Amino acid sequence: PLMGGFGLKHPPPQILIKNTPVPADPPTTFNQSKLNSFITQYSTGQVSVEIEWELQKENSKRWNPEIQYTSNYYKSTSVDFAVNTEGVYSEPRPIGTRYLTRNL
Amino acid sequence: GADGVGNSSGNWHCDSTWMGDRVITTSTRTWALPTYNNHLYKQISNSTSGGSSNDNAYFGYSTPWGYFDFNRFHCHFSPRDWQRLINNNWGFRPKRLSFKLFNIQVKEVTQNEGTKTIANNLTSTIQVFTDSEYQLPYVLGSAHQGCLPPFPADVFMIPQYGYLTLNNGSQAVGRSSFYCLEYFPSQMLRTGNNFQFTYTFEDVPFHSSYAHSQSLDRLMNPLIDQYLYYLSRTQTTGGTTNTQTLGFSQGGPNTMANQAKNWLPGPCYRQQRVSKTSADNNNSEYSWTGATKYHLNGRDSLVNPGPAMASHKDDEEKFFPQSGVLIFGKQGSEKTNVDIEKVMITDEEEIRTTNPVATEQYGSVSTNLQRGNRQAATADVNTQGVLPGMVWQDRDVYLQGPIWAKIPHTDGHFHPSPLMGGFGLKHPPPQILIKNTPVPADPPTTFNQSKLNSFITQYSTGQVSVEIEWELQKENSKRWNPEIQYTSNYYKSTSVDFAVNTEGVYSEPRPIGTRYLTRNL
Amino acid sequence: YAHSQSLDRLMNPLIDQYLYYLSRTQTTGGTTNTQTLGFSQGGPNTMANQAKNWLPGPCYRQQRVSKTSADNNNSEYSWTGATKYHLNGRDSLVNPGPAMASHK
Ligand SMILES: [Mg+2]
Ligand SMILES: [Mg+2]
Ligand SMILES: [Mg+2]
Description:
This is part of a larger assembly, with three copies of chain A. Chain A has 104 residues and is largely without helices or strands.
């Protein structure tokens, strides 16, 4: 896929969810029209997702040190990839995957 | 099944499964059931609803029960599944049914100071039973509203059960019967409970989901003469003084109308012809006076749709028999005196190969004995009962039409194919009756013998699933050329047919019959 | 046994049909009445117009005779007004004939 990632013919399927309609009180005389009065509802719960990933370990025979992703050592008002004083979490930068090197 | 308040008693099952010679349809819907008649049984008649004519007089009872109706093909077949059925099969019939009620919720309604409060009444019951021994008047089979909706996302209300017995005007007679539905065993369900029922259909003929590619009057070899003769001449030709003679000829390729044949077209009960273009019709009120009727115990009923007859002859598509075809309403069409553009008039032209045209005579018969001073006289036959050697096709079924009817419990019942179309069953899917059990409000603290008339306001809701297994007769067309098939139209549209619009309303834009494929006669 | 229902009264008396019938052929109101086509759904007050599945049994019409002699015609019609079949040049009375109800 051009945005990056894994192209799958048979990807993780779409998981669809809805609240079942609960009709409000119907009239006491029959009417053929579909019901349009429902009790106002929402749902909440927890969701868990577990993914197993396979790794290809680095086997660098290079003599000199490599580039590594590192947090910056210096003093900051906030720590990167944490919450601020108001409880808002932020991701301050994009992090790619190409730090290690290999020959062609 | 039996479980707790926080556990679901069933899952959503909507889909069709196509196998070798079988299709299993499954639809699930959400319903709502009010308390009907404030828990009472009531005597009703034409004098209780108003009263006008003896033709419309009745006597019966309204009950506090509701019932389930899924006696329409669209309760089971999606339009796509209907297309798959009709384009590929020469016949089908129902085999078995499974019915389930689950995820029952009983709700209490409190009306104080204009405030609308709806709460769960976890300890209240509904009552459900099946009339498996056909001990109650059977009202399924009378093309009533209240069916499972065609669109799975639509929520519906269950219709109220009522029935008729014998009347003399607005009055009862000694033979009139009263039925109490609480005089039956019924299952009682709370919110954790579910209901299930299974049924097997009796052996019924396959519906003929094809049209004939031959007509009854054109079964001969068009290259060969007959060995049989017909009377072709009764008077001498040529000269000045024409005299009596008897000349005989053999029917052949250019005299197919005179050929000896083995069979006769199906029976007739003539209907008036109405044009879909108002200007071509007579300027009078003939909806009743010009109507084809039956007369039973002093009252007239319309013959509607009546015997299966063809709607019109070749190049006469604008004409229909007055009450000889099924007429469906377009989405949202009203009950009374709606315009032609609000209805969908079915067309049974495909059966004109064996069945007479509804609006024409069956034929002509001799009415006298011709001689020297008396000329041969004939008359039109406008009613023709069955004759040996007659053949016919029954009325087609439609996606939005009925499936079955109960064959009346009678001594005689000739070719008991229900006239609205479908399957005639002596022992049809039983009536499934449902009601909310009355829950009395606080009684007085001093005994009083009077029946209680103060109840807590309740309704119920839940899901219903219906599964039908159908048997198919696959098309085995040895024809060389392509056949007719039902197809959606290829061109650009504001909306797609058999879908929802911008407001979420589902509509069925046309009737869809079953006779696309063809076969020889 | 006798039937406690009639063939023309098998419907549910509380519910309308989904099917329509031709209820109007001429405009109502005004001075100049013209051709129209109006359709209605049969219901509790129009049972006579409802779509039905069945038909009453066969008929071979008989003359009506009153048990009170004064209500009948002053002629000899025991034979001339009789319902008959014709077989090989002779007439036979249809007696009692097809099962039909005696009176309304
Ligand atoms: Mg329906
Ligand atoms: Mg046509
Ligand atoms: Mg019976």
